[PDB]
Design a protein around this ligand. Sequence first.
Ligand SMILES: [Mg+2]
Ligand SMILES: [Mg+2]
Ligand SMILES: [Mg+2]
Ligand SMILES: [Mg+2]
Ligand SMILES: [Mg+2]
Ligand SMILES: [Mg+2]
Ligand SMILES: [Mg+2]
Ligand SMILES: [Mg+2]
Ligand SMILES: [Mg+2]
Ligand SMILES: [Mg+2]
Ligand SMILES: [Mg+2]
Ligand SMILES: [Mg+2]
Ligand SMILES: [Mg+2]
Ligand SMILES: [Mg+2]
Ligand SMILES: [Mg+2]
Ligand SMILES: [Mg+2]
Ligand SMILES: [Mg+2]
Ligand SMILES: [Mg+2]
Length: 339
Amino acid sequence: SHMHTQVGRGLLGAVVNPLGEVTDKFAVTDNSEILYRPVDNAPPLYSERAAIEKPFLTGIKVIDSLLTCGEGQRMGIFASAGCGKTFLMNMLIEHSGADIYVIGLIGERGREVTETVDYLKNSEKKSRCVLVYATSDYSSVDRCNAAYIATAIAEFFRTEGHKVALFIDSLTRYARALRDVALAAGESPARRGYPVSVFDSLPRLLERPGKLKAGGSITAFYTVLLEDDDFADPLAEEVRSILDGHIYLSRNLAQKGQFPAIDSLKSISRVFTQVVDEKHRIMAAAFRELLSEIEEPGENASQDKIYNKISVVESFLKQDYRLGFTYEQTMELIGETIR
Ligand SMILES: [Mg+2]
Ligand SMILES: [Mg+2]
Ligand SMILES: [Mg+2]
Ligand SMILES: [Mg+2]
Ligand SMILES: [Mg+2]
Ligand SMILES: [Mg+2]
Ligand SMILES: [Mg+2]
Ligand SMILES: [Mg+2]
Ligand SMILES: [Mg+2]
Ligand SMILES: [Mg+2]
Ligand SMILES: [Mg+2]
Ligand SMILES: [Mg+2]
Ligand SMILES: [Mg+2]
Ligand SMILES: [Mg+2]
Ligand SMILES: [Mg+2]
Ligand SMILES: [Mg+2]
Ligand SMILES: [Mg+2]
Ligand SMILES: [Mg+2]
């Protein structure tokens, strides 16, 4: 729906339901600025936008080296359901360096909200974070406003000059509420269940981040559930065309317990070239080649030479949920791999 919510620095630390009223806190802020603002703004004008040049730093070896984000980039995260997803999302909030985090949970169960709120309660970031949510027992309309409230909230801190990270968990549940609305209103399913309206409403939502000439950015990570194929779920093909790339979490890698379960084969930052230097571009392309050739101890046979590179590769890609690496560390460690 078309609507107004609360924004401001008073909301830092807050949990916000799909109306706009705080229902819990993971932190207490000393500021109490609380303006009332529209939930459905338009994207910035092409004349208002900065170019994407400086990286968004996550702290996660495998994205900061091979899928570097740009401040103001809009990134997909494609994952089947589970922890994998929320393991990666917890790290982005932990080991990135954004000024503010706005997190929008859509359509999950109540336990899934509580888990995020407990995560937040134990994050040093907790004072820089806002959480909007809509569980599955709320209505289609309310699930769509969660997305809008959370963007709306991220938008305020952007005109106040902050570098903002935005997370929408399940775009595919945004979009499904979006359609149950359109079908309630009485509209004809075009594409595979979905009124043509939802796919013209999508660019408007997704182009409201990121970076502005006046200073202010919203880098936006957006989740997409993988349940069936590009024929059966139209979203993935559409979301792919509108966003600036995508991290693919792998079931195969997860089912072996490689975490984070990122298939760099299937992932791309579309702003890579323009946010990392030519040093990087090369070393990164190196490593990908390496990965390709590993496909082709235990413990004393001179096969040893194999196992010890698999194990620096596997050691580089794996990361402990508590550890953030900075550019240098990441870049050093990747150098130490291809020599
Ligand atoms: Mg609506
Ligand atoms: Mg950064
Ligand atoms: Mg890593
Ligand atoms: Mg990055
Ligand atoms: Mg998956
Ligand atoms: Mg999983
Ligand atoms: Mg998952
Ligand atoms: Mg984690
Ligand atoms: Mg975690
Ligand atoms: Mg995420
Ligand atoms: Mg803004
Ligand atoms: Mg948005
Ligand atoms: Mg940003
Ligand atoms: Mg989907
Ligand atoms: Mg598709
Ligand atoms: Mg776009
Ligand atoms: Mg893309
Ligand atoms: Mg790659």
